[model samples]
Target: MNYARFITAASAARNPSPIRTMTDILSRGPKSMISLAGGLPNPNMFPFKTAVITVENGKTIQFGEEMMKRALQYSPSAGIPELLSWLKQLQIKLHNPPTIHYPPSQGQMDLCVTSGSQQGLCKVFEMIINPGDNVLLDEPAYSGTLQSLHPLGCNIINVASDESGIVPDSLRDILSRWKPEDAKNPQKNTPKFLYTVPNGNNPTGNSLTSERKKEIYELARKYDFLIIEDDPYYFLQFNSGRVPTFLSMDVDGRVIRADSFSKIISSGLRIGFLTGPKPLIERVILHIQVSTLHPSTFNQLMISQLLHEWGEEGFMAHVDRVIDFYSNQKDAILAAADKWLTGLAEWHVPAAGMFLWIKVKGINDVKELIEEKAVKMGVLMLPGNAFYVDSSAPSPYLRASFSSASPEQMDVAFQVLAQLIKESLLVP
Candidate 1:
């Protein structure tokens, strides 16, 4: 595949970023080379001799002096050497994609660390999306992606999704009917990629089954569109095992897999990584080189040190504990839903993640219920209309999150909302 053909005019026109240019020149590392290059801060002023992280086992792992100093200094745009290697190994262990031999090179696969997977997604779009290119996404999508893709001038289309995620036939039908030159409207064209949240999807908590993933993968292969598998909730499942990732099943090297440490570890750390074909990753790294310089070195080193202490098995154990915590919260919310929401609204039990997508009878838009009544009742939820690309459109849905809700709080929240729903029905 000619990966270069997918690049936007803006990306193709970009020169090697200043940081990257300096890094390459400085890479020669002669004593006289760095006369006046980067304006980085002196490392001596950086405070903290260590970062102490309390792991899932209650034992703390400390990133001591050497690691702390290394973290405080400037690092490669791709990532610190060892941190990249460690993450690459974890990717291999988890997804089992094609491996690149030592001295990682373009065309096989590589990883790039970012401030978060959200930035990673933006960079991917930066690399490839030309204004007026077609892109497909799950309907009632993750609002963040909807916001990010809008400014690119891409003709965005939504593939119909069910409880299990994007319907294969729906995707196929959309692709089949698409005419690239139907550019009577340049804003609408045959899509070049399909973006999906394959696990514990946001807003709606449905996971794509393995069978469905294979079906979708095959469809992408047949249609020649890349799959952007934006999965941050892959490990936050209630079940012990999970369906294979799109990257795991990818034979054609077309899946760009984004992973994050926010949910499992710490959100404030802002450490995330992407793994995919090297050419794409290389483009993204150049974007990173230009913007943000790199993910916080302090943050990446702290996570790297923590991961080193916890190895693969320990990392898996930590993810399992996070799953257990959320699953218990899920149970609490469901119990409250059963007790309070029963006939007033309709819902599907979430198989994974923190949200409960509810369809309240007779409510065309959840704006009033959430903004007016629920706030007065001391309950809060997102209006489902916000999840759609067209925010002004009416939707029968609302989304509630249980990630931080206590059992007692869940009960009160639902109880208050239930009464609010009843009140809304009588308003007209």
Candidate 2:
């Protein structure tokens, strides 16, 4: 007579999610904060004037009107046909997937656009994550990602890490010997996903070399686990060499590449994409159909038009401009770290991304975050404890962003942070 248990679970679990909690945390106090905590794009490097000019000149007009019409209309189940065709070409040029054409309902892999790659990733979690399955997560992971994976009830395989990114040997060894304490139990299961940021990783700011990527890919194939390469920062990679992607390396559809525009164009666009097997992605799109059917048509049109206008080579040129912009800023910030925080801070010079993952010489508590050492010292840095899923384990860690800070602000911030460290220590 009653679906009480089902109704109860749905009703009770319908409260605010983990990201919603962070929303509450971010909304209050610290209005002028420099947050390395979030994987946000630097507003300084936006191609705004250029993008705006395109709009003003009516170059974007047709796309805009079409998108406007799309907003008023219900589109096909697959997507805008033209956009679909264009992206098929992009997949062939970029990822080199075997099924270049749309894979199909049972086979359907190619690509699926979403509100953001974050949503794409969540959808993959829905399709691939069986509750109680193990997920090999890079330690010191993005907080938002950890939270997203949490609801799946998968065991977060906390693998150890160093600056060069996830150690391939370690990952292979762990997976090779990966017997979950509950692996024998039918309810608990083996790892289904090895979630990695790869290039310009969120918290640690480390990127895997191409060779390392190949190694990880081979490991994924050998162990027969899925790889969720959530690389929003791929275009933001400041390296000179042409680094390959997981999708490119994947022959067996073991990799799902979640790419984003957040790091390139604008986060407000909320445009991201995923590539994998068609059957798996049909499930993702089905999940989308039930949730928010299709991404913002307006946003997609704008992005598609933008990409069309730039073409691949030109788009990459613009991307490299932004990349170099961040690269210089990163060098500047770290230079200040070297010049000012000498003998006090320890950090790796990141090959890509905005963050400076600094391990200060001393001071390891939240007390160290707000004390006279940190506050009165005139500099502010995000306490390292924030990145960690675990709050314990004495961290003299801090994170700083090179994205939004001006050269002047970086100087002042570094000096202040240095003073805090100096005070955090009991020097003679």
Candidate 3:
């Protein structure tokens, strides 16, 4: 793949900071080599000393003098060394990317920590999209991505999606508009990449089947476009088996995956990671060098220590516990909908994630109901139009999150919603 063509002119022109690059070299240099390259603060000058944390499991993580110093100081732009290594191993255990076995000419896989998956997604968009560039997106997409891309002035072509997530036929239909040879022609306006949330999608809460992923991956190869797999809810799956990820099937280094710990762990921790071909990952690191420098060092250390304590098996056991909790929440919401919204509204059973996408039966638009009546009635949800490319468009759908609501509360909310819809129908 000609990865360089995917990068925007401005991003491709960005060079790594010489001083920051030197600091990285010095950190890995021989102890005998002493030099003053970058203005790094002395660890001794820092007032903080030892630190300790007690987790819910009754185990304590203690950071002594050495670890404390490392935590307070600026680290590499990629990530804290140990945490990056641990994350790499985790990706291997789960995805086992084919790039790992490939030769240098084919590209190699790499990983980098971000403040959150959102940050990585934003940077990747900035790196690849130029103004007026064509980009493909899943219909009723994640609002945050829509906001990020809107400012870039790119043409967002929507691919139709249903309960099964992005439809491969719809993707092929769009790609079919341009000739396969046009993928190599600079003059052609073919889409640069397709952005999707494959597992437990936001708003919809749909998961793509393995067969669908293979078909989509083949389309990407045939069309010569990249795949941006932004999966924040991968661990929230309610199924007995895990769905295959785009990275797992990426033999051509065409997929860049953004994984988050926000859903599984603490959202406030603000830690996430990106896995992809080394060239693209390096571009994101350069963007980091100029901006955040790196994700919070102390936060990275804390997660790294936690992962170290919980080996691969223990970590997965913890994920299973999270899945079980969310699965019950899913059922609770479903029961509420069935009891109150049977004839008034319709929804697909969420396979994963926290939200239930509801379409009120007789309504032409849900905006007035959700933003006006629902809130006044002490129940709230995002109107479906907010998720689309054009927010002003009328839509019958709305998104309701079950993550924090109890069954009784959900039942009451649905009952109130049903009444409001009934009243609205009588207005005309």
Candidate 4:
């Protein structure tokens, strides 16, 4: 793969992570050599010697002594060694990504741990995007991604989508006309990549069907652009069928998949992994090495202990429990919507994740309703416009989370929102 041709000039010229460079220089010193190159904090001043976390099942996971020492000290840029190995095994089992040990090879995927999936997303953005380059996104996407790409000045395009996910014909149509001179009114810049939330997509709460995943993957293959699969809610699915991941089906190393434990485990832990082609991953680490220096070694050590304790069977059993919990929550929110918002709003019963997307009748935009109306009424839902690549675009949709609210509180929330909608209908 030709790295310089694919990367942004900024990315191609960016220096290696400074702190990592400093660490490397200092690490070569003999025992007799005193070094002052890096600004590492002393471990003794740290507050706690142990951390104990009790999962929902009442099982306790703890890290102390030696684990705490490793956690408190500087770890590898890739991640703490044990944690990276654990996640590599986890990725291999789940995605069956191609292996590239001993001798290096093209199209071989590798992994790196980051502070969180967002950091990994940032690295991917740096890896491919040049200012004014074109990028594809699912309309009404995750707001965080939109915000991340903004400062980079990419020409973001919305791929056509349905309840099932990104439409294949729509993608092909755009790719056909991507060259500025190919069509009279073609998009100026060629798209560098497509970013998607494959399972339980944000705002929409719509999971991409298995057929849709393959369709989009084929499109990625044809277009010669990378696919950034940002899936944080992979395990929260409540559906009957398990759709295959794009990473699992990837043959050309075009997919860079990011996975997170924020939704599945604890958000405070802030651990996520990036899996993709080694050359691309090699560049991502440079960004990681400089940006945060490395993720919290203590957190990685803590999580690694938890993984060892849970093992694969225990880990999956926990996922099953989480699904059962969220499914009941989903049911409550859907029932509430039917009872109170039936005529005033329309939405789909989400098969996975934690949200129900509502399209308010007669409302073209919900920003005012969220900031002025819904908050005053007590249910704080997000306006659909917030999720779009163009924030000011007209959107009739509203997003409500069923994750935290109790069933009774959820019913009240919808009832209040319905009343507000009806009141707004009477205005003007």
Question: Highest TM-score, which number?
Answer: 3
296-378 per-residue lDDT for model 3 (tens digits):
99999999988888888878889999999999999999999998899999999988889999999998998989999888988
lDDT of 4 by residue, 298-363 (tens): 788767877877887788888888899999999899899999988898998786788899999978
Task: Indicate the worst ten consecutive residues by lDDT in candidate 3.
Answer: 100-109
What ranges in model 4 sit over 4 Å off?
A: 14-47, 51-59, 99-105, 179-188
TM-score of 4: 0.90
* Candidate 4 clashes between residue pairs 3 or more apart in a chain or in different chains: 71-298
Measured with C-alpha atoms, the lDDT of residue 306 in candidate 1 is 76
Error of 4 at 294 (Å): 0.7
| Alpha-carbon shift of residue 293 in model 4 (angstroms) | 0.5
- Candidate 1 C-alpha lDDT tens digits along 1-428: 45655577667666665766677767676866644667777766887777776665745767687877877888888888778999988888878885354233334768999888999999998787877788888878899989898898888888888888889888878878855344234354556789999887888998888888898888777766788999899879788778789988766777888998889987888888998887778888877878887888888777777778778888888888889999889888889999998988999888888899999986777798798878877777898987888988888899999999899998888889888888878885
**TM, every model:** 0.91, 0.79, 0.97, 0.90
Candidate 2 lDDT, tens digit per residue, 335-401?
A: 8888888887788887777898887766556345544456665666676666666746666777788
Residue pairs with backbone atoms closer than 3 Å in model 2 (clashes) = 107-278, 107-279, 108-278, 108-279, 109-277, 109-278
Q: Stretches of candidate 1 above 4 Å error?
A: 17-40, 47-59, 63-65, 99-106, 178-188
